[PDB]
Structure formats: structure tokens, C-alpha cells
Paper text:
In this study, we designed a novel L-amino acid oxidase, HTAncLAAO2, by ancestral sequence reconstruction, exhibiting high thermostability and long-term stability. L-amino acid deaminase (LAADs)16,17,19–23 and L-amino acid oxidases (LAAOs)15,24–27 are key biocatalysts efficiently converting L-AAs to keto acids. An advantage of LAAOs is that the enzyme only requires O2 molecules to regenerate oxidized FAD. HTAncLAAO2 demonstrated substrate selectivity almost identical to, and higher activity than, the HTAncLAAO27; these properties make the enzyme suitable for synthesizing D-AAs from L- or rac-AAs.
The overall structure of HTAncLAAO2, determined at a 2.2 Å resolution, indicating that the enzyme has typical folding of amine oxidase superfamily, such as L-Lysine α-oxidase and LAAO from Pseudoalteromonas species, in spite that they shared low sequence identity to each other. The unique point of HTAncLAAO2 is that the enzyme displays a distinctive octameric state. We performed gel-filtration and negative-stained EM analyses to investigate the oligomeric state in physiological conditions. Gel-filtration chromatography analysis suggested that the HTAncLAAO2 eluted as 544 kDa (denoted by the red star in Fig. 1B), indicating that the formation of complexes in solution by eight HTAncLAAO2 molecules, each with a molecular weight of 63 kDa. The results show that HTAncLAAO2 has an octameric, ninja-star-like structure. This distinctive oligomeric state may be origin for the high thermostability and long-term stability of HTAncLAAOs; other thermostable enzymes also had an oligomeric form to improve the stability. Alterations in the structure to better recognize other L-AAs could potentially enhance HTAncLAAO2’s activity towards substrates that currently show weak activity. The thermostability (red colored in Fig. 2C) and long-term stability (red colored in Fig. 2D) of HTAncLAAO2, measured using L-Met as a substrate, were similar to those of HTAncLAAO; a T1/2 of about 85 °C, and residual activity exceeding 95% following a 7-day incubation at 30 °C. We unexpectedly found a NOS bridge between residues K304 and C505 which are located remotely from the active site. In conclusion, the NOS bridge identified in HTAncLAAO2 had minimal influence on in vitro parameters such as enzyme activity and thermostability. Alternatively, we predicted L-Trp binding form of HTAncLAAO2 by superposing the L-Trp binding structure of AncLAAO-N4 based on FAD molecule. The HTAncLAAO2 structure suggested that the side chains of five hydrophobic residues (W220, Y383, W482, and W520 depicted in Fig. 4B, and L320 in Fig. S3) were located proximal to the indole group of L-Trp. Enzyme kinetic analysis suggested that Tte W220A mutation likely introduces a cavity in the active site, accommodating the long-chain L-AAs while compromising affinity for L-Phe, L-Leu, L-Met, and L-Ile.
Author numbering:
A (entry chain C): 4 to 397, 430 to 539
B (entry chain A): 4 to 397, 430 to 543
C (entry chain A): 321 to 397, 430 to 478
The structure:
Amino acid sequence: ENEKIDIAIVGGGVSGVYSAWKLKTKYPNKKIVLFEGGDHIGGRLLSVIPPGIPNMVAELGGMRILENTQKLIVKLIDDINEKLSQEDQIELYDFPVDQPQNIAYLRGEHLRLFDFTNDPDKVPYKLSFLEKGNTSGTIIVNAIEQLVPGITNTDLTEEERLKMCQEATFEGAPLYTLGFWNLLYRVISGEAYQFSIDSGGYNSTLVNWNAADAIPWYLSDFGIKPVYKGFKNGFQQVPISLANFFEEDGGEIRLNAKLEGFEFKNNLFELTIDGEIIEATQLILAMPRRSLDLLTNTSPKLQEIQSLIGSVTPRPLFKVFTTYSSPWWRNAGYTDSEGGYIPLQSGRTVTDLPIRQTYYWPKNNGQPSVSGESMLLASYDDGSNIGFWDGLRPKALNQTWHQYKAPRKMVEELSRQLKQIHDVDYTPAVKNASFRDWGEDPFGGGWNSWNIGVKSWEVKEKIVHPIDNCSLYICGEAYSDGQGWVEGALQTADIMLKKFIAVE
Amino acid sequence: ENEKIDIAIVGGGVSGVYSAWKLKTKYPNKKIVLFEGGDHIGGRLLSVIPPGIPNMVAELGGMRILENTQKLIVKLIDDINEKLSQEDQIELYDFPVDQPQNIAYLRGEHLRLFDFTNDPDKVPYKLSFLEKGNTSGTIIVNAIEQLVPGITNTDLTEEERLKMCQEATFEGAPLYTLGFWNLLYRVISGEAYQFSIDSGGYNSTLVNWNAADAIPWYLSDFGIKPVYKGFKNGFQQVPISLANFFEEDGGEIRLNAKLEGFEFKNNLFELTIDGEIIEATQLILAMPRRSLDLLTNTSPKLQEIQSLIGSVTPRPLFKVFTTYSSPWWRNAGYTDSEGGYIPLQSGRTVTDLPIRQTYYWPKNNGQPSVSGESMLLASYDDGSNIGFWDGLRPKALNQTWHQYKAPRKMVEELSRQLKQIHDVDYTPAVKNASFRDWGEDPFGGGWNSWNIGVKSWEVKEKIVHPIDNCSLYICGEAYSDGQGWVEGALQTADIMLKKFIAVESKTS
Amino acid sequence: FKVFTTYSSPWWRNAGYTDSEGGYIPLQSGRTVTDLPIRQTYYWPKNNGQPSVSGESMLLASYDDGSNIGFWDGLRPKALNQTWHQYKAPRKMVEELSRQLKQIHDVDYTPAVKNASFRDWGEDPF
Ligand SMILES: Cc1cc2nc3c(=O)[nH]c(=O)nc-3n(C[C@H](O)[C@H](O)[C@H](O)COP(=O)(O)OP(=O)(O)OC[C@H]3O[C@@H](n4cnc5c(N)ncnc54)[C@H](O)[C@@H]3O)c2cc1C
Ligand SMILES: Cc1cc2nc3c(=O)[nH]c(=O)nc-3n(C[C@H](O)[C@H](O)[C@H](O)COP(=O)(O)OP(=O)(O)OC[C@H]3O[C@@H](n4cnc5c(N)ncnc54)[C@H](O)[C@@H]3O)c2cc1C
């Protein structure tokens, strides 16, 4: 006879373990089990210590927060830290991106980021009278101000801008019916759009997704002077700590426990897990769209809510890290007008090559690596660039570097491109390499974007509890206002928990 | 009791109707039914007459053949024409692409195609010492010669090149394990690659697909001086005529008959179509990968051959046509050094804008439209460009223009870009517009490409009859040597038919 | 100093150019020069004087004199009456020749060197 539990939570990412923790506190007498199909808690948070670099943490998934905007993740870090020992405290460090000396290897030209404003004739993009001599940030924020006048006023919050975008029209059409790429193309040159792709480092951010959602999202990060923090001991400590709390409080976690499908019979969820049936009175799916899509053929209730599930598009992201006996990139700085050497050593170098983005990985205190065993985020790339790298394939953390080891041919092509980007013919050998392709099942993407014609403000409220008189719940980054962020996952966990507590 | 037939053929594209025609001739006493889920025969061949232009045919799908290379489609046109009346004959016309006066609007600069070889300083790409002053064709063919020495020798056929690629290695690795984009990146600059994307008109052709398959495929079209023919009365006449022949010969066609799934029980195929079960002793799926993927959840036999089905990737293609009261583009030609005017009027203009490719649509005799109601293939685009157009959405032929009508906002953005491309502030209003997005189910793509690490020469022979002692057959463009072509669909139909005739009993 | 290298194909022929009428002019006979230590590279003729246009082919990779010889030297660790193998070139010398040949011909990839031989005529007793 079948195992019977009160609350089944499927998905061991941050929203799943956060939800488990909250629900066990709210309902201490309920039998709550969280099921993860993979071999570890964390989902798209994957923190690994590089071999030979005990004071670094490579972030194959999520790596930083906007501490000034993202109140939920900042508050959760405090909620975790008030329970952890002094030894275990989560500590943040300042996370650099655009230092002026960093390289932009664009259309075969070696630029420094300061060339974008200081030497427009050198920038090999035919930018217009208004665009010329500006960063991608400046060009896109100004484009957004032309499209939604008043939106870039710095006195407004993300929430006030999201509201303005919900009521805004463009040539008589509601913003939620229009595409971000379509609208940007009305106000910037094709060359400004390509410059913004290339030098901004991302293909997926400027795609034709929902303009009403894209505009406030863009303004709060990639626009107005984004300020970031990283995690001394890895972002993944957040979900690992919440899992630990849930288990201390009498919750149960099952790893290697894939939900294969579920039926709703006799006012119960019948979950098929490892060819066994488990009965639960409530089911919470803490998982993105692709994870819901994979369950749909064996889960009749998901077949009833296709238009809700289909309201976002998964956006693959790819990261690969490489390590070296020395930070050889530091030799690709320059000599200033007073004869002082300016080292290349922190933040991001960009390129239109498939590498797209290279980070000089900081020490766990935020300081640059100036000597000894050092690390690149060799490539952080999206869009059509992922196919290039894919074709070359043949307290405590809970995953090792070795479990994500990169294949040799992929590493050799990375080494070739890093050399062309930095304009050197010799670099010390790669010692270690790891990678993650977040386009892979069950994730479908690193982030998920609202589709054109969707009203996010309706879908996000509906999909947390999508069928009336049915104890089915959904949470995570995918159907949030904070897409591409842990903040988004916590936002929808909070909306879902509020509904769950009102109903059950 | 369930309806019982001998041969079920599912898919009313070229390979399906060709297979139906051949099999009914071979087995006149068998009950052969062809099922098409859509409302018409043709699949990715969709020919429509524009309103106001009775002497034109817009090709929303396939539009031309390489008459010198593609012996199967040339022979099929003869096989069709030897049965058609003089009135109905299929007639071909010469189909232009690169005229030297045509525009390349690249990185904000207005070029003519002759600038690529005549004025390299004007071409806004930082091409290397060896690349500079050349077309994309020249750069990529030379890259391919560096990668597989001897392959571009003009004495070789596509078949001899495919063989060389099967035995070739690159740095000790078999070619079939390597990616086309990865290898091109070893021999051309990033700027030459982007120049080849932009000016060559296509994103999907230069993706990281199987190098062993991509190289000979590239050489036979986009490389060595590609020469093309169009169809006076539409490519779609080919599958329509074969359907007609099949029915005259006693074959049956059911339209609006979507196969929902099939089971194999008691040595029969049980086909679920419109909530009815039909029994068939042989089942032929004349349909691409995505169509097989959509059947897989309700078809246990397809679940057994996932690695075969998964051996290609669908490649979306998008086309939208616009019409005007006059061919306004002809005013965007130039005055030669002797004061003669050179009109812009035939072949293709290219851009890095989302339009990507614009064709000055020929009359049904191949001649340019020089006055009166005229047509563009306004945009023929692929890769990330399709998302841009998609987000703006809110003898006889057998489909109308109006069934594919384009929405206003899509048309207004096309008009904006056409104006920027041609460097004009005014054009006469669009009268009519039609489009097709071939990324949509059940097609998944306009073409399908062999994946890296696949041995095409094994999969193409295996997948036509993928389970031993099981009368399941597959044909079409998707698992062919001629991907992106009617030729490929006929190639695998012929491989499939040969296997079918060797294996199967001729009885009822 | 002379050093010869062989390849499965005459890859240099791909470093010609397209003339003003669209005809390809192959790089395939005589000498390419440089101020790099290679100094002189010959596209080695067949025994009838005709260029090698396909199959196993050979460069006089470097024919160099003066201070250039020290650069190559520091990388060291009918019938005819001597064999190629008796003058075999060491790997590190060959890898540096390959690097320079690539920079000279403006290519990032060439098929691997199959065989290499050299002679330094500054040596005793000459
Ligand atoms: C490359 C990358 C960079 C990012 N950068 C940042 C950043 O810097 N800062 C930031 O804040 N955010 C970032 N993010 C986003 C952040 O990582 C995510 O938004 C968040 O981690 C997702 O949490 P979630 O609760 O939605 O679920 P997920 O993390 O998606 O977890 C869902 C879980 O459900 C499981 N599952 C699915 N189906 C089943 C099933 N049938 N049975 C059992 N288990 C199942 C999966 O195995 C998975 O573990 C990044 C993401 C990626 C990929
Ligand atoms: C934009 C575009 C441009 C092209 N250009 C050219 C060119 O110039 N020249 C050229 O030679 N080729 C060209 N091609 C390719 C050519 O059109 C195709 O390769 C060829 O027509 C495909 O034939 P097929 O037999 O594989 O089937 P398809 O045409 O793919 O037809 C398959 C059929 O199966 C049906 N089907 C699928 N699932 C089911 C089901 N469950 N039940 C019932 N029916 C089902 C579909 O409705 C469809 O009609 C082009 C393609 C496109 C899209």
C-alpha cells in the first residue's frame, strides 16, 4: 500500500528549499517531503572550488546580487545568517565588471572600454550622431527613455516602472503586446543594436521578448550603473543552508527522486517517483517551464494549463572556467601617460567572438588574483554562441569541479580565442577546466523571458495556483518579475506561500 | 470492426505523394491510402498567385532547383510532363540571385555587390590579407579547400566529395565528429565569418552542423557559381500532379487526417486518425524530424529509435512577400561611367538588418518586372532574425495568397527596413502581403541539418526502415544528402522504395 | 643553413589571390621572403621543374644565413649515398618553423609537418 504524505515539493532549487523551510515552520505537524531528480540541492546555483585555488569559488550558475534592488535575497541572507554559527556566516564581496583598461575585441580591433567614450573613431560601429561616443548602457537607457517617456527618472523603483509599462502605449498599442527588439529598432540604428549585443556581452537580453517586462528589468541591471555583490563561499550556500534548516526542523529531502508524472484521483495527488506511487494532499512544483513541459505528457492537470506554462521562453546560458599557474592576462594591461603600468586584472573583457565574455575571477574577498594559481570565467556566452562550444563536446558545498570537467577540444578552442582576444601567441597551459550548459534538460535555459502578448502581472498571480479547487502550486524564477535572478524565485515563492496559507 | 488497408502513407509532401504514386504502380491491387493532417497536398512546397499579378507565383516554400546537379527532380519533372497535356506542362525559367548592381546594406553602409571585389576599403569588414577583396563564396570555398585538401577540385561530383569527407581527418579526428562553424573558425577570421553570414544572406547554413555533410552540400550550391531554375506555375505543381496521378491510378488521399499515434499489435499497424483506428500492414512516414517527434509520445515504436530521429536539427526559415502598384526598387540603380542607367531589377539584395534577403520577384518567364503591379520577396530570413518578425504578429494550385495574409505591423516594419536598405524616404504603399514561418509545427524547420558526431551514410540507409522485421518506413528531406532540397526528399524516397520492394509481399 | 619540411598537401597554394578578372593565382613556385629568421622559403619543385599541385609536398622551409642561423641552432637539443633520416630535424626546431610559416602566409592552421631534415654548413670541417 502506497506511501502517504501531506505536502510534496518537487525541485531542490532555491524556491523549492525556501518553500519547504517556510512550510515546515508554518505547519510543523505536516509530513513534508522535497524531491530532487538530480544528485544534489541547488538547481541553477552551482558553486565549485577550483583545484589548486582553495580561496576561490567558481559560479557555474548564479554568481551575484544587486544588493540595492533585491530586498528579498538580502533579507533571506540575514534570515540564514541569524541561524548560522559565526564560522558559517554568508559573506558578500564587491563584484567588478567594467574596469576602463579591460579589453573589447570587436570586429578584429583591440579596444579598451575607455575607447567607447574617449575615441569614437576607433570604435568600428557606424553609430549615429546621438549614439556615437557612448557605451551600450547609455545608448539603450536613452532608447528606453524615447520609448516610454519618464521611465528612466532615477526617483522611480522597479515596481513603479513595471506599473508605468503596464499602462504605457506605443503608437496606440499596449507595451505588453510589443517586442523589446522591435521597439529598440524604432529608436536606435542597426549598428547601435549590434554594438549593444557585442560590447554588452549578451545575445539573450536584447531578444524580442515582452517590452513591458524587458524595459524595467533592463533599467534595474544592464542600464543604470549596475552595482553587484558575490558570495565568499558560493551562492549555492543559500539553498544548501535552507535544505539543512528544513531537515533539522524534521523535513525530509529525497535526492535522485525524479517525478515521472502525477494524476489527481480521490482528492489526492498520485506522484510516480522511481516507479512507486506516493500520495500527497498538496503538490508544489518549484521548477521552470522546461521542467513543467517534460512532465506534461504524464500529468493531465499540466495539459489543462498549456497557455500559462507557455507564457515564457527558456534562454540557454553557458559558462566554462579555466585555471592557470599564473594570471597571465595581467601582462595585457597598458602604460599610462605618466609611465605607470595599468594591469588587466578584474571584471569583464568582451568580444564578438563566441567566447563573448571573459571574467578575471576574483579571490573570495573580491580582490584581484595578482600571482599564483588563478582562474578565468573563460566564456560566459548565450544565443547562437552556445552551439559553437556544444559542437566541440564528444558549512560545505555538495558538488566538485571534477563532476563538470570540460573536454580537451573545447578547452583548446577557448585557449586559441583567449589568445586572439588578449593579442598574445603564448599563454601558460590550462591546468583545469569545468563547464555547464544550462540549455540542457531539465532547465531548458539559464533564465526564462516573458513572451510578447502575455500579461505578466496576471500570469504570475494565476500560475502559482493555476487550477481552482486543486492543491497544485508552482514557484521559481521562470514566472517572476525577477527573471534571470534568485530574487525572482523568492518573489514567486512568497506569492505561492501566501496563496497556499490562505487556501489550505 | 476497424477499416483495413494494405499501405498507409502519412505526409502529403513531395516524398509522400511520390512514394504513393510509385507504390500504386508497383502494387496496383493493394489498397494504398495517403493521409495528410493539413488541408492540402504540398508540405514545404507552397505556391500562391499574388492578387493583381496573374503572371507571377510567390514561393512561400521551395522555389528553385540546381538543374545541373539535381538529376532526380529533373527526371521527375520529365516523368510528370510525359503524362501531362501540352497545356499543363511544367516549365522552368532561369532564376537570378547576384546581379552586380544589387545592394548590400551592411553595417550602415550602402554597397553594390561589385564593391566586394572592386572596392575593399568600402567593405566595412576587417578581412585578412588573404580574404580582403573577395565574395563570401570565394572566402568559404578557399576555407573548405584548406580544411579538406583536393575537395574543391571541379572534376569531382557531390557524391565523390561526400566520400572524401567520410574518409577525411582534420588533426587526427574524423570529419563527421567535427562542426562546420568550428572548422571554418580555424581557417577564416571572425570578420570573414560575419561577412559570409551577412552578405551570403543566411544564418542557418554556416551553423555548427556536421562538417562531413556541410562541406559537400556547401560546395554544390552556395560555393561554385550556383545556377538555378524556377517554376512558371509554381514548384507545388510537382506534388499536386503526383497526387492527381495516384488518385487516377486508384489511390486514395485523405486531407484533414492527422495521425495522432500508432501501435504495432498482431503484425498490423493500428493508426489513430480522428478518434478512429485504421489497420495497415505497412506504414510509411513521409515527414521530417519534428513530425516524428510529435508522434513519439503516442507511438511506442518511435520511442525505440530516438537516436536515429534525433540525428538532425530542424532549421526554421521565414518568407514574406509584398506587392506594389509599381516596381519602385528600379529607381535605386545607378548611372555608369558612360551615362547609361543600370536598373535594380533582378536577383537578391542583402542586409545585416532582420530583412536579411530581398528578391525582385521575376515574371513566370524569368524576366524582370519593369512596370505595373510588382512583387518583392520582402524578407527571406533565418536564425535569430525570425524572432524579430514573429514578435510583430498579433493545372490548378490548391492554396490562396489570402490564407497566408501578413499582419499590418509586420508589413509596416518591413516597409521601414526596405526604405533604409534602398536609401529612399518614400515608397508606394504595400497593396498585399503574405508570409510563412516554417519553424511552426509540424515542420520544426524549413530544412534539417545532420548533427555533429552522426554518420549520415549509416543513418540515411538505416532510418528508411529503422526496425528489423517491422514494416515501418520513413522518407523525406530530413534524413537525406540533399537537406534543404526536394532532391533530398526524392533521394530518401528512392532508398525507402528499394528497401520496401525487397522486403514486402505483393498480396492484399 | 637549410631545413626542409613535408606535408600531405601543398597548403601554401591556398595563399594565392584572385586577379581583377576573378581568376585565382596560386602560390606554388619559387621563393617567399621575410625578415623573420626563416628568411627564405621555396615551394619545392617536382624533378621536372613543375609545381607540386596536390599530394605529399615539400618546402625548403628556411634557407637562412648570418645571425639567423643562431636562432635555429639554439632550438637543437644511379644511386644517392645519404638518406633524409641521417639529417632529421628536431621537433622544437620544426614547431618554430611551423609558427613562422603560418605568420608569413597569414594562416592560423596548416597540416602537420610529416618529415623534416636540416644541415648547418657553419659546422666543422666546412
Ligand atoms: C548561468 C546562470 C547565471 C545566473 N546568474 C545569476 C546571478 O548572477 N544572480 C542571480 O541572482 N541569479 C542568477 N541566475 C538565476 C538563478 O540561478 C535562478 O533564477 C535560480 O537559481 C532558480 O531557482 P528556482 O527555484 O526557479 O529553480 P531551479 O534552480 O531551476 O531548480 C529546479 C529544480 O527542479 C528539479 N526538477 C525538475 N523537474 C524535476 C522532476 N521531474 N523531478 C524532480 N526534480 C525535478 C531540477 O533538477 C532542479 O534542481 C543565473 C542562472 C544561470 C543558469
Ligand atoms: C522556405 C523554404 C525554402 C526552400 N527552398 C527550396 C528550394 O529552393 N528548392 C528545393 O528543392 N527545396 C527547397 N526547400 C525544401 C523543400 O520544400 C523540402 O525539402 C521538401 O518539400 C520536403 O518534402 P518532404 O517529402 O520531406 O515533406 P514535407 O514537405 O516536410 O511534408 C511533410 C508533410 O507531413 C505532414 N504531417 C506531419 N505530421 C503528420 C501527422 N501526424 N499526420 C498527418 N500528416 C502529418 C505535414 O502536414 C506535411 O504536409 C525549401 C523549404 C522551405 C521551407
